[PDB]
Structure 1
């Protein structure tokens, strides 16, 4: 009976930890998202065409 019961508590515990981690991750993302996105799009737009460094003539 103890085994039948306590595993519910353990499940609640582990899901609680998972929810906390997901919240922390989502918060950090929602904070740094703008500065990552602007950089990423700027890097996409900055083309800088170059010939292969081995080209001859």
Structure 2
């Protein structure tokens, strides 16, 4: 019974830890998102094409 009660307490503790960690991550991620989207889209729209460096005429 000591083992089973300790199992209950330890379980509840670890799901509490998991949930708070996940919520903290989510909150941190709702801080800054638009900057990176701008970064990726801006680098996508740029092209600057060129020929392979080793080409000769």
Shorter-normalised TM range: 0.7 to 0.9
Distance 2:23 2:7 in 1: 24
Over aligned residues, Cα RMSD in angstroms?
1.2
Q: How many residues are aligned here?
A: 57
Please, what TM-score do these two structures have when normalized by structure 2? Answer: 0.82
Runs of 4+ residues over 4 Å off in structure 1: none
Determine which structure has the larger helix proportion and give its number.
1
**What secondary structure does 2:51 align onto?**
coil
Distance 2:8 2:18 in 1: 15
Distance 2:32 2:38 in 1: 10
